[PDB]
Amino acid sequence: QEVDLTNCDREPIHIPGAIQPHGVLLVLSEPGLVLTHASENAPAVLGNSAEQLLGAPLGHFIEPSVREPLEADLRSARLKQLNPLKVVWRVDGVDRFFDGIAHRHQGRLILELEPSSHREAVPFLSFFHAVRDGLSRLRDARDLQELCEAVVQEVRGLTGFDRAIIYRFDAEWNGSVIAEARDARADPYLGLHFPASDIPRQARELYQLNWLRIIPTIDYQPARVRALPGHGEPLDLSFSVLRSVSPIHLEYLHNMGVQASMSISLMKDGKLWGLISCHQVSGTRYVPYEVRTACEFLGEVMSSLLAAKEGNEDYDQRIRAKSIHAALLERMAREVDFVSGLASQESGLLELVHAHGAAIHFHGRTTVLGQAPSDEALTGLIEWLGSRTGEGVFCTDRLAREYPEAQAFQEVAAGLMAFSMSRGRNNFVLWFRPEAVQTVNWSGNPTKAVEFDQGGPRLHPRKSFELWKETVRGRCLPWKAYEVEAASELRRSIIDVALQRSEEL
Amino acid sequence: QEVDLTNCDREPIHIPGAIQPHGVLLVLSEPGLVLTHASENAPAVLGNSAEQLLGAPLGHFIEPSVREPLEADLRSARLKQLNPLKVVWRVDGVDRFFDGIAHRHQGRLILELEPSSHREAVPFLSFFHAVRDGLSRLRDARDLQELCEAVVQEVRGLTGFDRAIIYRFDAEWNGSVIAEARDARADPYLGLHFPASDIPRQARELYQLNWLRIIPTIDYQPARVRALPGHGEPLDLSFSVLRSVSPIHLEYLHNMGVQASMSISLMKDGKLWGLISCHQVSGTRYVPYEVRTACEFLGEVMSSLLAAKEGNEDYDQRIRAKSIHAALLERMAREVDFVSGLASQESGLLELVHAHGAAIHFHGRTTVLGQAPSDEALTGLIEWLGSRTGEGVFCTDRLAREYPEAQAFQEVAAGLMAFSMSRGRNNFVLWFRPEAVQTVNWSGNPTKAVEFDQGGPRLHPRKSFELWKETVRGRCLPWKAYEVEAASELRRSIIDVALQRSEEL
Ligand SMILES: */C=C/C1=C(C)C(=O)N/C1=C\c1[nH]c(Cc2[nH]c(/C=C3\NC(=O)C(C=C)=C3C)c(C)c2CCC(=O)O)c(CCC(=O)O)c1C
Ligand SMILES: */C=C/C1=C(C)C(=O)N/C1=C\c1[nH]c(Cc2[nH]c(/C=C3\NC(=O)C(C=C)=C3C)c(C)c2CCC(=O)O)c(CCC(=O)O)c1C
Secondary structure, eight states: OOOOOOGGOOTTTTTTEEOEEEEEEEEOTTOOOEEEEEEEHHHHHHHHHHHTTTBGGGSSOOOSSSSHHHHHHHHHHTTTTOSSOOOOOOOEEEEEEEEEEEEEETTTEEEEEEEOOSSSOHHHHHHHHHHHHHHHHHHHHHHHHHHHHHHHHHHHHHOOOOOEEEEEETTOOHHHHHHHEEEESSSOTTOEEEEEEGSSHHHHHHHOOOOEEEOOOOOOOOOOEEOOOOOOOOOOOOOOSSSSHHHHHHHHHHTTOOOOOEEEEEEETTEEEEEEEEEEEOOOOOOOOOHHHHEEEEEEHHHHHHHHHGGOOOTTTTTTHHHHHHHHHHHHHOOOOOOSHHHGHHHHHHTTTTOOOEEEEEESOOOOOOOOOOOTTHHHHHHHSSSSOOSSSSSOSOHHSSSGTTTTGGGGGGGOOEEEESSSSOEOOOOOOOOOOEEEEEEEETSSSEOOOSOOOOOOSSSOOOOEEEEEESSOOOOOOOHHHHHHHHHHHHHHHHHHHHOOO | OOOOSSSSOSOOOOOOOOOOOOOTEEEESSSSEEEEEEEEHHHHHHHHHHHTTTTTTTTGBBOOGHHHHHHHHHHHOOOOTOOEEEEEEEEETEEEEEEEEEEEESSOOEEEEEEEOOOOOHHHHHHHHHHHHHHHHHTTSSSSSHHHHHHHHHHHHHHOOOOOOOOOEOOTTEEEEEEEEEESSSOOOTTTTEEEEESSSHHHHHHOOOEEEEESSSOOEEEEEEOTTOOOOOOOOTTTSSSSOHHHHHHHHHTTSSEEEEEEEEETEEEEEEEEEEESSOOOOOOOOOHHHHHHHHHHHTTHHHHHHHHTTTTTTTHHHHHHHHHHHHHHHHSHHHHHHHHHTHHHHHTTTTOEEEEHOOOOOEESSSSSOOOOOOHHHOSSSSSSOSSSOOOSOOHHHHHHGGGGTTTTOSSEEEEETTTTOOEEEEEEEEEOOOEEEEEOOOOOOOSSSSSSSSSSSSSOOOEEEEOOOOSSSSOOOHHHHHHHHHHHHHHHHHHHHHHHH
């Protein structure tokens, strides 16, 4: 299987067929630039019913002097750079001014107008210091905490959001507010863990594609998108600025007491690393696209810089383990029975991967070594490995997640790292580890992270986001990066001296 | 001792006591205030002569509303996130505006003032957009050829230089132009190679620490950094931006017919990996600090991607290899004599590293697969001890370097990929490659450059930079690092079946 979706992961956030009403979404034909769809809030904002617009060339509605550069651009395929377009819409004799945001996706050409007349507006002065200084600050960050610390201060500053945090995912996609800047109005979340389920899978993948979103108000009545016939196929809105969002997330922000929000994907290695996340606790926030893409730009600068600073590292040990490996290989090098010459090095063996126990099943015939008793349970643990995969270095910090019968044992208070000495898969090498107790602070009860309706099958978000002390058990400490290099390394040398043994008949 | 300094690794280019004069170098006491050094070209740039300037405190000549934030700024511990400084100079009744570039080095505070051109909204918005878009273009580079191409186009875009190239060092600290964007009317340096003696060691070392230098004109007059008595210790000007470059280099640049110069260090692994080099072939090039460090920032991001994008090189042959190797992994199952399992798909085994000969020496008996040396291949097969495998893959394109008897057969094997199968080192796979004649475009006879004055004991650069072919004998076509990879992978996979086979009989 492997994944293994829950109820939340089954929603299609991408094709709601409705948008946020504060500005208009059109799709143009190519090469006609003819309005094929138009969202029904068109009069409200533009001056025309959808009726009037469906099936006209676009140049009909544009003030004749700015017709040329706009067409010339829309037809460019260098588009995402050209944004934001200047659009002037002329009803009767009156001119309205919008920012055009255009993109092509799944064969359509979408254009979204946001009013740039009646504005929030950002004094260029501090727009200038944010992207000019901001860049310099980030680049001068000494460690991972200073980078985070700078990016939330700069973004907040440029946007005047009440709260703006850094949320960092973990290996199961649980969250964690590892940096924060705010105005004493908002309750500090620095520290709180959130469940994986707050940002479900169909979201998280969308967000790896579209690195920026903004909800200026949770209170709107979505605008349906009209078409003219032939195109009742639900239009794909993955890259719409104005796409309407899942209403249980509107309800979630409502249970969180935030009135507008905005976030930005952080990427390390083209998988979602974290989020910059911004809340207005009270009052809508209509942030102009320029200031959006300025903030978006500052996440891309952090993203492109995480690998440097989060490489504050630990390259020692690594040199230590590289030197424990040198000794062990030497022992086996020299006994004619290396299994018995490996476990004769209980220290170097235990200390290669930082384990508190270890085991060697070889031609029979278990020999245990450190502090991990099992024995009558170790037999279950072994043959369990041989069955369906366990090749190469298995590795888990919660052996009840895979082998649910380890909860019965010491648990990952004997945590596993293992592999087979050969491909025939009959001789293994194990590794066990104590428990990491660790009381963890949640935002609300995790186990009631989803509440249900009447009477109804319908999912609502939780109500309390108050702190909630959980003590997590089975999980041990993580198997760090190098610790799993030195397993395959030791695997590769167990194979060499074994190969040289038999070459010696 | 490693390096090994010819005649140029002496001249202390870091204490010339003179500056490129288009700006003013200052040295301020601390706590704040009061100047002890002043470049003599003070009055050209700034009104006042360096004798009115010497001894007085800075804020005396600064417009008053500007004077507190500035001395609050020149104290801050970390001024690198501050540059450029808003310095407003009030000579007579007029204000003149300068970029201030601040830095502390060897207990001394330096302030160099370039002239500033006042930042306006519309042109900044385009500058921001271009750093923002050139940045993603680096991120999205598939391979190193792409990553480089991006860099020089973007740097050029932002700067208006005639040429930007990417200059890569080899093992001897020689050079080669490996990517190039340029206005076409100026001569094309792509492909060229330059002797290790245009950038002597103390210059490479200096650029290892300071990553950006700009010579906006090569014909200029070095304003001397004058001072106050008691403060005559030579001025450590390494982290200066005005620091007058060493004179022989300026002859290098006139003689190269280049009028303005800019360069940026790239780092891979803390060693100096290459540069991004920039040239104005007719005209000057004064590039404001902001635009300047925004290219250095692209230089950081470039270096931080060297290793990833390069591993993705040949991302079509890698597939092939993976596929041929898949093929050999299994034809070594149908036959219990896995050796002939390789020798059947010898058309394979040879295309796996694009070798035209091979040799398998297994249990004392050897078999030969392509054009190979005489059956006294018992040569290299015995020849090795230090390096030699140990394990794993050994690899050359000058076998008659390490193992001189190969001069005999260097027309059927002047290169050699070989590894040893067992820790015993009785078993080897060997791959051969013939001598390839190979022609190497230098930039005018590289045996020169090491040139003297009259000859008086002064140093002088070359004179003709014209395409000087070298013809490199005794070598084979270089081994692609994905070929060594394929050979490494193959070796470990032969070991797994040499184990599995013996173990199970
Ligand atoms: C059954 C599913 C859901 C439950 C239960 C729930 O509580 N939310 C569910 C679905 C859901 N969430 C989102 C989008 C989303 N979620 C978050 C979560 C957080 N915001 C924060 O500030 C913090 C902690 C500091 C967390 C953990 C965010 C940021 C987002 C992005 C939207 C935004 O920034 O406003 C979706 C997708 C909505 C969409 O249309 O894209 C869904 C279905
Ligand atoms: C006797 C020593 C020298 C000889 C001979 C010579 O030719 N130069 C010598 C000394 C020297 N050079 C530099 C600075 C420098 N040199 C280069 C070389 C190149 N620029 C190019 O475009 C290419 C190829 C196309 C080459 C090979 C560079 C790039 C630099 C860096 C400065 C810059 O780019 O403008 C120094 C140090 C000068 C200083 O004062 O900082 C010295 C001592």
